[PDB]
Design a protein around this nucleic acid. Structure first.
Ligand SMILES: N#C[C@@]1(c2ccc3c(N)ncnn23)O[C@H](COP(=O)(O)OP(=O)(O)OP(=O)(O)O)[C@@H](O)[C@H]1O
Ligand SMILES: [Mg+2]
Ligand SMILES: [Zn+2]
Ligand SMILES: [Zn+2]
Lengths: 927, 73, 187, 187
RNA sequence: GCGUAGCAUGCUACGUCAUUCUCCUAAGAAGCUG
RNA sequence: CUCAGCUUCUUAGGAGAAUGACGUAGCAUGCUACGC
């Protein structure tokens, strides 16, 4: 029977086949599926046992990558598929089916043989690149190897999967680009074929073989010709991140779309690519039903800007990088021609045009001078071209005449303190406490190198039907707070003596620009920024701080015209976030006065089987996608439901993206262009990172909940929760408030979170996470891999099991359960090496004396006190060291003062600092 | 305690060099800072002392910048 | 503080008390003098409080006025500085080439990134290693931005001029990279 | 602070109070002495508050002047303090390589390039006198920084490569010092 | 027995001086965290 | 040489509470003088 069946399978195609089945029996294998039926839902990995698969052999007896699959099904589905295939035969993007009947024992059993398929469907590729696990990724190695994307031994490299270690993996993935583009074209052809043939059915990923030929016609209901409805919400949306991970549209940069032919020479003066964007959308995403506005200026709400921007972040990787950035124009001001920005061409939000352009102006008040002197049009138009080959980021101009190299000093040394420590049995050979935090020095070109670190920021397209729901859930985490636009006289700025970016740092600190402008003008500038875009020149400074690793952290000092208005826009909400206790975003909650025990016991909010986990993002601000930061700025700007209109909010978003996301960075006397990612010097950085972190965690939860099989969820509440979550993602276009609240309650009851910028501590239920009904460490590694483009190693992830010890590390402060006042409380202690390093190595040279810097060792001992009850003794003596050294400093100060000028200091207030009672009072809940 | 006494001598030595205006030599400063960062990142002690020898040789290369005779006494 | 009418009354009452105490040890004289001294002390304390308050208010007003005057002076100074900077950079951009590129623009708006790329008569290429020099700007004339640039100076990381012939693979280590090479626009 | 005139009143009245409490003459005298003691106590209290405030101000002035002077002294005296600290730490380190290199550089045997650490690399070290040559150099072997280096070309001050056999004992005076010996690590 | 003044004790209100404590505005030095 | 949070310390200022002291006004009670 084997040869009779195999011979029939190898029909008129005239092919030679090797059978993978045993005796013409069904084959069972693991395969991804985008399944949504009456029973289960979710893009998970199932067993597939309905088909018998043979593999073709080319000449010379070698297995070519082509398979003859043979589905076996009842007569009803066979007859319903025969008609729908004969009605779709003429389409070229459809695998050549072959229908027949076979006798096994005493009855016919129809067979639908799909011919010339490939081993891995598109769903397998999407799942492998979307749910990535280091330990077992064998559907990605096979896909890469079998399609000439790399060598079989390319996977012997140390870290072949790490976007940060070896950026060559990007090229290996991009070698899949043409196949994905051909899949897009073939699915557009198939949608057209079924529209012209009047077939209505759902398009699933797991039916398109990697070549592109669709091969399943089961649930294709038929209607009159010309009235087909191909449902492509769960296909074009699950295929989004893979569409820029593999740079599917790179081949659109070449003339006539051919890869071989040279790049299409776009005329440099072109900035309005609206026609090209619309043409690309109608060529690839033809049947994506929702409207696409290439310029987001004419969108409808916060949920349409995300959609349009998510499409633009892919349609702008075809157009030249020298056409984005500000649009300049010659405005005459009393007969002198300026070159001022009169718009912007964002990579995501399309073309934005200012509404207040006044050629032939007469007077320039302080506000107008502030706006013009900040725009990079004058600076980068009057500067001389510059081709900096030390980096990959674009380069605009060189304001100065010659580059400036900034070094980093090596950090002074505190000889007396180190001698005292060594005398008191410290820094011995092989001790539990050792010097590990040093002041590292850097060569001339450190600043440019740490700016070049932006090469990790790639254009990332985010699954939109999942992001538009994760945004709602993330918003529920911010519903407690209140905020809005505040007038200029309600603004609170901590210190006004901190520099004001560029070029405003050439004439004064921020105090000059905050006191030289009246409140009416300071508010007129804000109302102006609410009606047009003002580009700004950020300046990247170096940080001179003690650290355990020798990367020279750079901080993006933003211009005054940007911070001074982001404050009016965001201060109310930021203070509301910093003044709310018991919320997910623990900002403003001190670790002193029992403020850390409160944090921990708020985290442990009735989660049945707690198992703490925590993750630190590697390069949180230099790898955060543009889309996630745009969404974060939208979530913080949704409190303005009354103060600002829709266009006002959009222009505020455009200003934030012009001044933070993709700006002109003046990294040491030259204007480069940031690819993206947040500038960690703007008003909303520690709060715009919190939103991004919560978005990543919630997306991990969504993926972990969906990717479960569905029949193996014993709990019948969670099965229905999954079945409704999938249809709320991919089968609903409007917000489902009741279900958003239900899922937020589910997350709070099973995924309690404590988020602080990029430092998170989850207290997830252990049994559900084991069963996959909530996130986990792998379910977050995968999310980072396919959304942040950084593989998160196990060095930045921890998972505790005994709640008593508390989190392994949160904000660099370990936690310990200790006895205090008849009750056990969690005290945070630092790394002792950090405290000893802060003692021995000091920033300045005047601080080295110590005798006139006793108010520093008190503040170090305040942080080092908790160590005084650590079980280890070398850990706990790094506090008595500070107490005894403060006593020594006081004695020496008294002696020196007596010698130089005979005045015995008034004691009884300085004797608290070398007694533990004063420091122990700092960790009691009285205040 | 012979190990953690090199990670501090290297800091002081690079501070001394940075005061002799060795920053100007963009290659000598790169070599000095690389030796400094490698000494500070030195699990072993033989490597730390070899790199300290090299850095001190940088300091002694300068003819009259530092008066060895006045100090070693 | 011997000021205000209250102090005169206080002094007169104190003198009367001192004179009458000897004349009258107790009784009506002492009681009346004590009452007068007490009321005078109350009035003097009232006047002293009013002074210490009004003087403080006036001093606060004067310091506020000085702060406002200095703030206005700094406003004027920074406005003048910004205007001078704008007029310096406004008189430096290539009016000929920049106006030419803007004229052939459709709407009149041109992306900023192509203002220096096509109208700047200088190029400062920073080269991190020799191979880059060999493969990007070899010789005394190279081609960038579809324009022929000619070298005019090659300084090293020390801002010390480096001759073109000195740069070779054999003599590459002896240099101080990166090399900043300034080239003009040779039509 | 019992060193101000008001305290004297505190004594006198208090003294009288003492003489009263033993005497217990009557309640009218008790009230009179209580009033006197209360007024004296208020006067002394005001004086003591003034004295303590002034002493605190003086202490703040002294502890600001001292801090400013010490900061200025430390900032000014840092070029030499760093070098003294460095060599104190080096001589306390007590390592053979550092000690040998410092001792050699004491007497003019400074190296002309960073001492290499690879398997073999160039090192050019000057030699002032024949005594140092005898101490460290011998035939083709060279003992510097506690490692054997292979002599290659002893270069005279005049760039005249001198054969090793020339330099021996009393023949040195003819040759014009200081030599520049090259060497490579021999591990 | 009641009223005015005077003396004595007690209570309420108000105005000052001082000490201590708490909170809040502002200025300065410093430390830690993302 | 950026954004934000937290904390220690010093001084200036404002408000409040408690205690002590002084003074003025008012009220409760005891006593001498003048009154009835
Ligand atoms: N807020 C904030 C910031 C941050 C750090 C330091 C500063 C600063 N001085 N000003 C403003 N923001 N800021 O915190 C994020 C994470 O900081 P973390 O020290 O974990 O650094 P990574 O994770 O980038 O590095 P890795 O984990 O590889 O060591 C940054 O990205 C940035 O947004
Ligand atoms: Mg991190
Ligand atoms: Zn839209
Ligand atoms: Zn608003």
């Amino acid at each position: 029977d084997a040869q009779s069946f195999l011979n029939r399978v190898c029909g008129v195609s005239a092919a030679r086949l090797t059978p993978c089945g045993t005796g013409t029996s069904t084959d069972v294998v693991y395969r991804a599926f985008d399944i949504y039926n009456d029973k289960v839902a979710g893009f998970a990995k199932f067993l597939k046992t309905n088909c018998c698969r043979f593999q073709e052999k080319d000449e010379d007896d070698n297995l070519i990558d082509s398979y003859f699959v043979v589905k076996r099904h009842t007569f009803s589905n066979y007859q319903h598929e025969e008609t729908i295939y004969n009605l779709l035969k003429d389409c070229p993007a459809v695998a050549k089916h072959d229908f027949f009947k076979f006798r096994i024992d005493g009855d016919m059993v129809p067979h639908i043989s799909r011919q010339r398929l490939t081993k891995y469907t598109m769903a397998d590729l999407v799942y492998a690149l979307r749910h990535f696990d280091e330990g077992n990724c064998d559907t990605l190695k096979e896909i890469l190897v079998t399609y000439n994307c790399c060598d079989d031994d390319y996977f012997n490299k140390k870290d072949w999967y790490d976007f940060v270690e070896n950026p060559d993996i990007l090229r290996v993935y991009a070698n899949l680009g043409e196949r994905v583009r051909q899949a897009l074209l073939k699915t557009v052809q198939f949608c057209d074929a079924m529209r012209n043939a009047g077939i209505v059915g759902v398009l699933t990923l797991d039916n398109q073989d990697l070549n592109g030929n669709w091969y399943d016609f089961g649930d294709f209901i038929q209607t009159t010709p010309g009235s087909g409805v191909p449902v492509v919400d769960s296909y074009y949306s699950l295929l989004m991140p893979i569409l820029t991970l593999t740079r599917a549209l790179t081949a659109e940069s070449h003339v006539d779309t051919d890869l071989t032919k040279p790049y299409i020479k776009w005329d440099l003066l072109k900035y309005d690519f609206t026609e090209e964007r619309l043409k690309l959308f109608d060529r690839y995403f033809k049947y994506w039903d929702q409207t696409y506005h290439p310029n987001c200026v004419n969108c409808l709400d916060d949920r349409c800007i995300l959609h349009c921007a998510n499409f633009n972040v892919l349609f702008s990787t075809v157009f030249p990088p020298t056409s984005f950035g500000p649009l300049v124009r010659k405005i005459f001001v009393d007969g002198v021609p300026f070159v001022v920005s009169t718009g912007y061409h964002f990579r995501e939000l399309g073309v934005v045009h200012n509404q207040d352009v006044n050629l032939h102006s007469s007077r320039l008040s302080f506000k107008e001078l502030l706006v013009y002197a900040a725009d990079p049009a004058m600076h980068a138009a009057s500067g001389n071209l510059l081709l900096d080959k030390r980096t990959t980021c674009f380069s605009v101009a060189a304001l100065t005449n010659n580059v400036a190299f900034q070094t980093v000093k090596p950090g002074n040394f505190n000889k007396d303190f180190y001698d005292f420590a060594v005398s008191k049995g410290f820094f011995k050979e092989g001790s539990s406490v050792e010097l590990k935090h040093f002041f590292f020095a850097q060569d001339g070109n450190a600043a440019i190198s740490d700016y070049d670190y932006y090469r990790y920021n790639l254009p990332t397209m985010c699954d939109i039907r999942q992001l538009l729901f994760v945004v709602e859930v993330v918003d529920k985490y911010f519903d407690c707070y209140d905020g809005g636009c505040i007038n200029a006289n309600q603004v609170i700025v901590n210190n006004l003596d901190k520099s004001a970016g560029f070029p405003f740092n050439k004439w004064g600190k921020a105090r000059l620009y905050y006191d030289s402008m009246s409140y009416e003008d300071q508010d007129a500038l804000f109302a102006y920024t609410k009606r047009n875009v003002i580009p700004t020149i950020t300046q990247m400074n170096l940080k001179y701080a003690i650290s355990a690793k020798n990367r020279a952290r750079t901080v993006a000092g933003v211009s005054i015209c940007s911070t001074m208005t982001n404050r009016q826009f965001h201060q109310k909400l930021l203070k509301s976030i910093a003044a709310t206790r018991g919320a997910t975003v623990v900002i403003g909650t001190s670790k002193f006065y029992g403020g850390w025990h409160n944090m921990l016991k708020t985290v442990y909010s009735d989660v049945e089987n707690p198992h703490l986990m925590g993750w630190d993002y590697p390069k949180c601000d230099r790898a955060m996608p543009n889309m996630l930061r745009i969404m974060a700025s939208l979530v913080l700007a949704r409190k303005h439901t009354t103060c600002c209109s829709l266009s006002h909010r959009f222009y505020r978003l455009a200003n934030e993206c012009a001044q933070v996301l993709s700006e002109m960075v003046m990294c040491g006397g030259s204007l480069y262009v940031k690819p993206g990612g947040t500038s960690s010097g703007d008003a909303t950085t520690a709060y715009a990172n919190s939103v991004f972190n919560i978005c990543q965690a919630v997306t991990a939860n969504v993926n972990a909940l969906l990717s479960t099989d569905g029949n193996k969820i014993a709990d019948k509440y969670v099965r229905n929760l999954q079945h409704r979550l999938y249809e709320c993602l991919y089968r609903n276009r409007d917000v489902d408030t009741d279900f958003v609240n239900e899922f937020y309650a589910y997350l709070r009851k099973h995924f309690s979170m404590m988020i602080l910028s990029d430092d998170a501590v989850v207290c997830f239920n252990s049994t559900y996470a084991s069963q996959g009904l909530v996130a986990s460490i792998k379910n977050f590694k995968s999310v980072l891999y396919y959304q942040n483009n950084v593989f998160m190693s196990e060095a930045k992830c921890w998972t505790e099991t005994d709640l008593t010890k508390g989190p392994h590390e949160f904000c660099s402060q370990h936690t310990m359960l200790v006895k205090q006042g008849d009750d056990y409380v969690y005290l945070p202690y630092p790394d002792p090496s950090r405290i000893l390093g802060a003692g021995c190595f000091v920033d300045d040279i005047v601080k080295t004396d110590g005798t006139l810097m006793i108010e520093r060792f008190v503040s170090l001992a305040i942080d080092a006190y908790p160590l005084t009850k650590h079980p280890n003794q070398e850990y706990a003596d790094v506090f008595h060291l500070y107490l005894q050294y403060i006593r020594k400093l006081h004695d020496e100060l008294t002696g020196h003062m007596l010698d130089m000028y005979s005045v015995m200091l008034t004691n009884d207030n300085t004797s608290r600092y070398w007694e533990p009672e004063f420091y122990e009072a700092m960790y009691t809940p009285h205040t | 305690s012979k190990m953690s006494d090199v990670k501090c001598t290297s800091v002081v030595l690079l501070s001394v060099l940075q005061q002799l205006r060795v920053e100007s030599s963009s290659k000598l400063w790169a070599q000095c800072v690389q030796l400094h960062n490698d000494i500070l990142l030195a699990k072993d002690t033989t490597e730390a002392f070899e790199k300290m020898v090299s850095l001190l040789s940088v300091l002694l290369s300068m003819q009259g910048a530092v008066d060895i005779n006045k100090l070693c006494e | 503080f011997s000021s205000l009418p209250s102090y005169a009354a206080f002094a007169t009452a104190q003198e009367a008390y001192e004179q009458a105490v000897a004349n009258g040890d107790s009784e009506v004289v002492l009681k009346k003098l004590k009452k007068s001294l007490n009321v005078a002390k109350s009035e003097f304390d009232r006047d002293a409080a009013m002074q210490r308050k009004l003087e403080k208010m006036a001093d606060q007003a004067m310091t506020q006025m000085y702060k406002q005057a200095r703030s206005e002076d700094k406003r004027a100074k920074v406005t003048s500085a910004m205007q001078t900077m704008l007029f310096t950079m406004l008189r430096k951009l290539d009016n000929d080439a920049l106006n030419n590129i803007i004229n052939n623009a459709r709407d009149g708006c041109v992306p900023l990134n192509i203002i220096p790329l096509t109208t700047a008569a200088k190029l400062m290429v920073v080269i991190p290693d020799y191979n880059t020099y060999k493969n990007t700007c070899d010789g005394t004339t190279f081609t960038y931005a579809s324009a022929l640039w000619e070298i005019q100076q090659v300084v090293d990381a020390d801002s010390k001029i480096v001759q073109l012939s000195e740069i070779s693979m054999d003599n590459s280590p002896n240099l101080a990279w990166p090399l900043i090479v300034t080239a003009l626009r040779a039509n």
